[PDB]
Design a protein around this nucleic acid. Sequence first.
DNA 1: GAGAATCCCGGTGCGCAGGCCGCTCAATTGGTCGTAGACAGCTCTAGCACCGCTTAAACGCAGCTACGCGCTGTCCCCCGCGTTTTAACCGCCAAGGGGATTACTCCCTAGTCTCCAGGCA
DNA 2: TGCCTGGAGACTAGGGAGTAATCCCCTTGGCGGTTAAAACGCGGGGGACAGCGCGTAGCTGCGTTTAAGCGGTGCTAGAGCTGTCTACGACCAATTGAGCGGCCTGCGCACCGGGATTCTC
Lengths: 92, 90, 96, 81, 79, 105
Amino acid sequence: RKESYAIYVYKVLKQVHPDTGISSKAMSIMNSFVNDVFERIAGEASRLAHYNKRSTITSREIQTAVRLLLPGELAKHAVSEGTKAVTKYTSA
Amino acid sequence: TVALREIRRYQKSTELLIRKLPFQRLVREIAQDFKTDLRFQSSAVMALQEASEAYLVALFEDTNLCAIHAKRVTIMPKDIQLARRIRGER
Amino acid sequence: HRYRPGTVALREIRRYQKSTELLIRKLPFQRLVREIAQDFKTDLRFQSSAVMALQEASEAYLVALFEDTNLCAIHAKRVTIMPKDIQLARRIRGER
Amino acid sequence: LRDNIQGITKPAIRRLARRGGVKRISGLIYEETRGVLKVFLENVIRDAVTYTEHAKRKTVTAMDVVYALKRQGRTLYGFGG
Amino acid sequence: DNIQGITKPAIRRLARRGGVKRISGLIYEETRGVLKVFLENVIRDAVTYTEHAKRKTVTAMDVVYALKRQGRTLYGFGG
Amino acid sequence: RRVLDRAARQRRINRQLEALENDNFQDDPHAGRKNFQALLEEQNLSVAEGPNYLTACAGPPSRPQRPFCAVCGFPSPYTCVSCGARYCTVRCLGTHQETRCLKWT
DNA sequence: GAGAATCCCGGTGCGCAGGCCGCTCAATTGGTCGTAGACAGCTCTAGCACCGCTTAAACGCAGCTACGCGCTGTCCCCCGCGTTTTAACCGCCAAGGGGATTACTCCCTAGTCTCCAGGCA
DNA sequence: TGCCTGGAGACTAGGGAGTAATCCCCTTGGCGGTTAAAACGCGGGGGACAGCGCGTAGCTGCGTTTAAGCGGTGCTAGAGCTGTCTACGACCAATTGAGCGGCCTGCGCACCGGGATTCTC
Ligand SMILES: [Zn+2]
Ligand SMILES: [Zn+2]
């Protein structure tokens, strides 16, 4: 069994471009990209937690890592999306 | 005239510019020194070729910038040397 | 007496490469740092060590950039450094 | 606090160039160097302020600047960590 | 001597992809040397990764990790 | 961008105008006596010394010069800053800058 | 041969680096005990080594002319140095406020374990 | 489609707020000097930039030559997976000494001052 983000990437693509497909090589590129940004954000969250002598990675750590890593407009939009997701999650 | 047409032709394309078999031989020759009787996956050699061609294209672009800065159209080895020296790979 | 052009420049090159002292006045740099920071967040206090670290990093960055700029100037058969030299150095470095 | 970029002085930029080995300097180099230093400081200070804001602090410590520089790829020694 | 396998027209193609109009005759040796250095570094790291895994076959993941640690990530082979 | 002084503009205009009097643009296909300037300097022709070749030259026109586009020939409201050549549209300006502005390709 | 800039040897003063002294807290020692993985053993995949055609690319020559480079000739703009500005920087004079650190308490909130069904490769 | 794996459901111990206290330390308007880096002329040298003329080296076009590429085949090294069972590392109490500041004081290094040597013109 091999795990990949191909299914979720396909779902997102269908949400954004319902009539547009994706080739296998492009899907591999997308999986690699998702893994790369995941590892980068998690590594920055880990460094932030270790610097502040905190044993837990919380939403604040991920938000700060996103602000540090992503450029301006992407960073602010991602922060808004994450805050919205967390707010919806806590209220359900 | 032909140079600009060739630039556009290779610029629009995506295929690998280096021939596959000579590059595979070069990769195996380089790897021979580090370890004996090394086997390579085909995907590994394809990845090496992709990285090498991207590296060379980016370097050539920086060397073209260096040549233009010298009021020259031809690229000379000193341009490659300066590109690598400024980039820091020296 | 009057030294021919270039001699005093080389003399001060040797002088400033012998030393390790900071070359920018500390108060103007502190004001510049505070001016840049007030845009990101108001009511921010800088420790003296933080400002000194910023000054050291900035001076090292500028020295290395000037080395690259001088290499660009020697290329294309020149001695003077011009803004095109800095632009080429930055573009080759991967900035901009 | 306004127009503090002029605090980077022409003799200061000349001294930095002399440390870098520059013999002759054009008149337009000073504005370019001021802009480049402005950009570099903006990036480093933004990262440092993010680190300080994460710790719920109001004082930017040298450790925060060191962490910002390390993130930028410019690790600095002698100021802790 | 397989470095001559990188033919002069291939170097011309790479330069043209980079927008170079004219190429000097001494560029070919220089670019062969540069490519040899780059390949030596990447392959050395990849062989280190392969040896650590007690494997005798250099997989694509080894090359991907070597490139990533060299500072130039490569997409499309890691997943 | 760079700017060309009056001497450069006048030299370019004189060179272009003299090229219109050239017999051929190519060289002799066989590839293996005076000229007009030698004739003028030998004649030692002085102005106001009665009717002659120099005094017969037509004077400046009264009607002002009409600008035309250096690329397509249609009337040109615009003047290139760097070299002073006239042009009429963004496309024509790009063509002029790529072909004949500054360095004369 | 003049001048100007270092350089080189004594003296000297200061502040900090290297050392000694309590004290504590975190390595160390001696145990138990899950379990990670080292080691057989198997399987079956793909990496390599051979052909034999197709043909597109690489190569060697010829002819050509485009541009790199050396050589001159302005001329402008930056350097070296003198004279004037000014802005770092210290001092003041005031009343208390920050604002990061270390100890207590204490309570949500993660982790761990059990069971189950459904998301996914 | 048949799983593993993510999701309820109960305990539970501790990480991370609150809350003092507590210690450290300037903090900021308007003032007034006062030097030493800046700032401002400016004369002139020399470097930047623009021609101009060669002449040679890249570029293009062509006819061979070559080997990359593609398709079968074929054989095995070796990548990947599984079952055992030990050796090894995680916890956990007691010791204990090595490593922290606190505090001090030689001594190295910064600096000054003549005289000498070296560098530029
Ligand atoms: Zn037109
Ligand atoms: Zn023009």
